[PDB]
Design a binder for these strands. Structure first.
Ligand code: MG
Length: 476
RNA sequence: AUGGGCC
RNA sequence: GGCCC
């Protein structure tokens, strides 16, 4: 986005500056080029001279202003994608009740009871549990009043800035490229779920290529559905973005909210408003109040869906800005936020699409960096989606999500105190697709120390998950 | 150390 | 409690 105002109000938003992540027994064995991101300016691992809280916001390098002609085309692509989207999902997008927003509904998980509260509830020493009854699904006086303000459309707020405590490639930890988390007031997240909760639940249920969204999918069982789909096309592209979230221009966001969340589609008038509040935001980091125009907050209730929707429109826009007579059936794509996989039978020139994505403020580059640019002829087994490859399982013939051995090694190298055992079992679900030999090697360091699931058991669990009949017929 | 997803 | 974005 574009930093338009930097202030120094006399109230610290003390940030958390000590990692919960610690090396495991595997760290000594795998020696990964990874490590927990820097949370403090006084981190010895940082490069001398690097000011953490200057690199954090360095991602905001402006807010691209689209011309009248470009804006007209974008609206035309937004409406077209919306048409497809609401054609599959339906028009049942009525506001969720205060109760359903908290407890959640079929296709939508419940709100986190004990996580960050936001402002100014943090400055007043209050957790979420004090403002909202997460059991019965009722709200306190504070939220109550705020919700009314949002109905009147007069509600203002500030985004709390959090240092994302996670494992990152050493080079970026040493550069100070710590990702940031935009914590929004709990009432804002609640109301957003009230406005578009029904819709989000529908997208999750109807995930797939036809709506261009993988949000809500289960890689275990859906890699077969996505795999056989893309394997039918001549060309498959693995496109990457740089600062996808931050580079959403205000023009694009506004038009997207206006075209997708119209009342005629079964939405509440305030569905469009609440989303537009994400466009112009004020961020509170310690003593500095930074006003940002453009970009998308990280802590939004539907950040992933918003990013995915945009991603779909961007592609349609870029293709229509370069070629003539481009429609939604000219290509196919699956998206999860900034993660994207495109496919088509036409020999599209993605390298030529570069300047067209720039008109949106986005910068595109080919995933694999062996080729100096986008190339044709790639298939589904060449690309990567959700940090997973598309590999064929010889025993079943189905596609299986396989993560790189380095990634898994990095994942198993670090863990937060007292959760090692529960993580191992979770990672085993990811590793199992790397084969018996690789699975065995990765968990070697943990043998005797923790319970490790047998490759056999997790393989059998998978076969039934992806196709029960196949597991049933296997007992002919 | 957060939003949504999935086990 | 983990992973993904
Ligand atoms: Mg990719």
């Amino acid at each position: 986005g574009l930093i338009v105002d930097t202030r120094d109000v006399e109230e610290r938003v003390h940030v958390m500056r000590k990692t919960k992540l610690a090396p495991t027994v595997a760290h000594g064995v795998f020696n990964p080029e990874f490590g927990p991101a820097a949370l403090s300016n006084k981190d010895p691992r940082l490069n001398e001279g690097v000011v953490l809280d200057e690199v954090i916001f360095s991602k905001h390098k402006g807010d691209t202003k689209m011309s009248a002609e470009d804006k007209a085309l974008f609206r035309r692509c937004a409406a077209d994608y919306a048409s497809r989207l609401h054609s599959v999902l339906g028009t049942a997008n009525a506001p969720l009740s205060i109760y359903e927003a908290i407890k959640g509904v079929d296709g939508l998980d419940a709100m986190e009871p004990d996580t960050a509260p936001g402002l100014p509830w943090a400055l007043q020493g209050k957790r979420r549990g004090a403002l909202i009854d997460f059991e019965n699904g009722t709200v306190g006086p504070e939220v109550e009043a705020a919700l009314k303000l949002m109905e009147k459309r007069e509600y203002k707020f500030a985004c709390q800035t959090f240092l994302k405590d996670e494992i990152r490639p050493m080079e970026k930890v040493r550069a100070g490229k710590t990702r940031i988390v935009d914590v929004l007031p709990v009432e804002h997240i609640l109301y957003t779920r009230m406005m578009i909760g029904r819709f989000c639940a529908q997208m999750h249920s109807n995930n797939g290529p036809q709506i261009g969204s993988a949000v809500g999918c289960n890689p275990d069982v859906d890699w077969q559905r996505f795999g056989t789909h893309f394997a039918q096309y001549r060309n498959v592209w693995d496109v990457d973005y740089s600062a996808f979230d931050a580079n959403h221009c205000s023009d694009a966001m506004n038009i997207m909210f206006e075209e997708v969340f119209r009342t005629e589609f079964g939405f509440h008038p305030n569905a469009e408003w609440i989303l537009k509040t994400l466009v112009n935001t004020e961020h509170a980091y310690e003593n500095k109040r930074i006003t940002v125009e453009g970009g998308i907050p990280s802590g939004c209730s539907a950040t992933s869906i918003i990013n995915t929707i945009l991603n779909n429109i961007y592609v349609l826009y870029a293709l229509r800005r370069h070629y003539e007579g481009v429609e939604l059936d000219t290509y196919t794509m699956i998206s999860y936020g900034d993660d994207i996989v495109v496919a088509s039978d036409y020999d599209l020139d993605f390298e030529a699409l570069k300047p067209h994505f720039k008109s949106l403020g986005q910068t595109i580059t080919p995933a694999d960096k062996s080729d100096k640019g986008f190339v044709l002829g790639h298939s589904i087994t060449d690309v990567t989606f959700l940090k997973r490859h598309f590999h064929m399982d010889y025993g079943t013939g189905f596609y299986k999500p396989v993560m790189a051995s380095k990634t898994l090694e990095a994942i198993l190298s670090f863990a937060r105190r007292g959760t090692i055992q529960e993580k191992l079992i979770s990672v085993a679900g990811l590793a199992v697709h790397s084969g018996p030999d690789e699975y065995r090697r990765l968990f070697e360091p943990f043998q005797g120390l923790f319970e490790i699931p047998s490759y056999r058991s997790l393989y059998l669990r998978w076969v039934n998950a992806v196709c029960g009949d196949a597991a049933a017929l296997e007992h002919h």
